Ligand binder design. Structure first.
Ligand SMILES: Nc1ncnc2c1ncn2[C@@H]1O[C@H](COP(=O)(O)OP(=O)(O)OP(=O)(O)O)[C@@H](O)[C@H]1O
Ligand SMILES: Nc1ncnc2c1ncn2[C@@H]1O[C@H](COP(=O)(O)OP(=O)(O)OP(=O)(O)O)[C@@H](O)[C@H]1O
Ligand SMILES: [Ca+2]
Ligand SMILES: [Ca+2]
Ligand SMILES: [Mg+2]
Ligand SMILES: [Mg+2]
Lengths: 167, 98, 319, 319
DNA sequence: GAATTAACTGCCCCCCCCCCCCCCCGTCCGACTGA
DNA sequence: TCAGTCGGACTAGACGGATTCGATACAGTTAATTC
């Protein structure tokens, strides 16, 4: 029964998200309904409240959220998947030399993670062949080399292209 | 940890205990730290975290750069050798040179 | 920890029924508390009375107040899709434009971003049987490009009262970003008195190009746009209306592009891309015909369609 | 029409603040009301609280709320349109040049932009019953091609006194982009002093071709042009005059092997493409006959018309 | 003539590959065509 | 009769590149000032 074993929550503020992860999530994990946590956009609440001159409160909130998420994941052995947005380089470091885009939320958020992925799509300039080009890349991991592959989106779901992994 | 003084006291005590253990049992203590952006002048640069008092709580300090697609291991503080710069990279076999 | 299924008998059920529920794949109170009623009662020999009884037992035993995907889909399945006036566009968008979401159209110059807005402002008042939304319309203007005589043509095409249509479309003009953002509080106040089915902003990012200029003012502009889009999303979620906004384009003057057919990208950066749900890309076609392409959508594949701008509004290409 | 800024001190504003606003460029209450808070902050003697009070008073004086479409439609129907001197052009434009919006004309050389500008400069002084506007004319010249002999010829055609017509036209010459932008404040002062009904800027983008040469100066040029267009738009909204500007063309070197055999597009880019409300495309026919085409409009279908340049000015194609 | 203060400038190095058309300004005549 | 309009041969067809923009302190060098 796929439908009845998925729970959906809505938040609007950073404080609302913090309260949700502090109160509602542990109740669901402890009783055993779910063993997977997905955040649709962690960067969305933080990009609407803090400017370039308010880095310290944002860092405090990010550290608290990361600590709470890591504690819950370690306690209940449930993977945590976070979806993030990107910002351009605006060339005038962190390992991104010739990349046009980089993950958002700075380096404080990047210190809280374990495996960092990156999904990229080449626009019509490189996608003038008829179909969009999508590549899923591994940025860093304690046990995975930097690699990449290709995938397509269809009516069935996301499927990777066989014989495409780069070494 | 909102109270900075408690953190400083704990860090100093931990460093003293670790150096005592190393000298008493003939060990080689290895510690790992994190980098933090500091907006100096107007061009931000990465500096080690945990404040400035912690700076001389370790006998030897090493920093790993990124430069331009090239990993560099630069010695920072040591009572035996002058600071220099050395390149390195990670292979599927582990920590290697070249 | 979790409460096993062996606790139901103390609440007023016999071993037979609790076992019947147990071998049906369920093994805990938590699973059966949120189980759908029809899937609970479809088993032969299961009566609705005892089903409601055990549901009440679970509700007073299991912590409730958690939304579920099946309940989320079966509770909000009465969404409305307003027709755009073109059969090809309705087919491409699979019925029209949904409510409770933000749809943006971006393109260059003489493409039909305002004619579509006018047609939607007229067609949103049609009865739900005829493909409308049965509500009023709100038009927020930033360029002084609102023509009631264009709405009159569509109202005459669909056989509606000319004077009634012009009475259901509230109008407002924005002169800066502060005024544009301030108008949303008045909109929220107005949406309680009556029922609205559409809200049009044209153009959403027209004033941001000139109010903030240069690299120095980029961050403030982006944050202001993000706050405005957050307010729009809150309004759409609270009142269940359809929000349609229009965007502009900027050239790509670097050598990375090679197809050389006047490369262009929408303005606004990543905030406007992430905030909006469905994005459409209109381009010029032969004669008065135009081509509409789906740029981004969570549940649609990229495709193409052709429409035309006629004397009666947006329609289909003539033969 | 507009209320002079000298009515703010009656609401609780010290005279020095009004004087500072006057040096700032705001000469009416409407100008202050439309301005964002950031523009008011940049004044030396005005703080945030002073700007808040001034904005509150301006919003009290000027209505900036929501309105029914019926009121807007009724108010729009009484706007004035100025005849172009040609019956075919008037039929194509459905009355003539509208007031309160920016109209742009572009084309290659000897296509008749300056002659149309002169004809509009003369015909704008006619009584409203004859297709005029009953006002004065303002001519801003950036090339040095202003000749009062054409104005005298048109006045003799229309049976007006030559001396009076020449006395009702204001002329200024712009030598650079910075000087061109600086001329839009004295224009505001003269417009608030006396009733004007037209404003010709020819050519609007002539100096930008030379002041900014390469690709490394594109961003600054586009930002300057956008600010200039925003100032033109605020003038048009505040005083309700007709704004007519002219443009130039640039070749399409890539070609792409299209049928035109000599492709060319107007200069300025997406900024002036999205800012202009109505655009006219002029080209040469045979002898003295020219062809005008609708290139962009919110309420006019794409169509063409033929006019001619005679010894009396712009007129219908003489047989 | 000189000690002394004040004003204008400056902080820098990577992109060497090459399918891609797109919505007409053709210049105009032959013939169709319906009225 | 009569002009607008669909569709199209008309002697002949190829060509390539191009750069900038930030929000900032202190020294170096040249210019103004009063004894
Ligand atoms: N009555 C009509 N009959 C036929 N076509 C019309 C009619 N009114 C307008 N049009 C055409 O519709 C188009 C109007 O473009 P529109 O105003 O939608 O552009 P836009 O995308 O809003 O542009 P901008 O960026 O300047 O705001 C023009 O190409 C015009 O020729
Ligand atoms: N007195 C006149 N009688 C008849 N035709 C005239 C007279 N004066 C000028 N013209 C016509 O005006 C034409 C040029 O028009 P105009 O000066 O408006 O050009 P334009 O499009 O403004 O040019 P530019 O691009 O150089 O600014 C000439 O080709 C000429 O035939
Ligand atoms: Ca989206
Ligand atoms: Ca336009
Ligand atoms: Mg428009
Ligand atoms: Mg001229």
């Amino acid at each position: 029964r796929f439908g009845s074993q998925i729970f959906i929550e809505h938040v609007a503020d950073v404080d609302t998200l913090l309260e949700c992860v502090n109160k509602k999530v542990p109740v669901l994990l402890s009783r055993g309904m779910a063993r997977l946590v997905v955040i649709d956009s962690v960067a969305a609440p933080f990009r609407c409240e803090f400017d370039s001159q308010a880095s310290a409160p944002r860092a405090r909130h990010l550290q608290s959220l990361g600590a709470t998420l890591r504690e819950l994941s370690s306690a209940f052995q449930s993977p945590v998947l976070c979806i993030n947005q990107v910002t351009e380089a605006m060339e005038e470091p962190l390992g991104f030399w010739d990349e046009r885009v980089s993950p958002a939320l700075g380096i404080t958020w990047a210190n809280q993670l374990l495996v960092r992925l990156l999904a990229d799509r080449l626009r019509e300039e490189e996608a003038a062949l008829g179909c969009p080009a999508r590549t899923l890349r591994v940025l860093s991991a304690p046990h995975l080399p930097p690699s990449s592959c290709s995938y397509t989106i269809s009516a069935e779901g996301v499927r990777g292209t066989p014989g495409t992994q780069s070494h | 940890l909102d109270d900075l003084s408690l953190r400083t006291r704990l860090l100093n005590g931990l460093a003293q205990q670790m150096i005592s253990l190393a000298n008493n049992h003939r060990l080689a203590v290895i510690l790992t730290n994190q980098m933090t952006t500091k907006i100096d002048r107007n061009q931000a640069l990465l500096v080690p975290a945990l404040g400035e008092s912690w700076g001389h709580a370790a006998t030897i300090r090493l920093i790993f750069h990124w430069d331009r697609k090239q990993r560099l291991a630069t010695l920072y503080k040591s009572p035996s050798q002058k600071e220099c710069t050395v390149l390195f990279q990670i292979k599927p076999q582990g920590f290697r040179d070249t | 920890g979790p409460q096993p299924i062996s606790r139901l008998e103390q609440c007023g059920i016999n071993a037979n029924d609790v076992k019947k529920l147990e071998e049906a794949g369920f093994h805990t109170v938590e699973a059966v508390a949120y189980a759908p009623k029809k899937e609970l009662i479809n088993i032969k020999g299961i009566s609705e009375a005892k089903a409601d009884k055990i549901l009440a037992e679970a509700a007073k035993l299991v912590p409730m107040g958690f939304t579920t995907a099946t309940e989320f889909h079966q509770r909000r399945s009465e969404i409305i899709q307003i027709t755009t006036g073109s059969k090809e566009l309705d087919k491409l968008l699979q019925g029209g434009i949904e409510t409770g979401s933000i749809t943006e159209m971006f393109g260059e110059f003489r493409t039909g971003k305002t004619q579509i807005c006018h047609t939607l402002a007229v067609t949103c008042q049609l009865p739900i049987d005829r493909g409308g939304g049965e509500g009023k319309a709100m038009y927020i203007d930033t360029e002084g490009t609102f023509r009631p005589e264009r709405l009159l043509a569509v109202a005459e095409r669909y056989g509606l009262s000319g004077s009634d249509v012009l009475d259901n479309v509230a109008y407002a003009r924005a002169f800066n970003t502060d005024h544009q953002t301030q108008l949303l509080y008045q909109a929220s106040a107005m949406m309680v008195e009556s029922r609205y089915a559409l809200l049009i902003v044209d153009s959403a990012t027209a004033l941001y190009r000139t109010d903030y200029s240069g690299r120095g003012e980029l961050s403030a502009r982006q944050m202001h746009l993000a706050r405005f889009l957050r307010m729009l999303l809150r309004l759409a979620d609270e009142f269940g209306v359809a929000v349609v906004i229009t965007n502009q384009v900027v050239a790509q003057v670097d050598g990375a592009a090679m197809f050389a057919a006047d490369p262009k990208k929408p303005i606004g950066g990543n905030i406007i891309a992430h905030a909006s749900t469905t994005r459409l890309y209109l381009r010029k076609g032969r004669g008065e015909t135009r081509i509409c392409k789906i740029y981004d959508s969570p549940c649609l594949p990229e495709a193409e369609a052709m429409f035309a701008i006629n004397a009666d509004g947006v329609g289909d290409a003539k033969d």
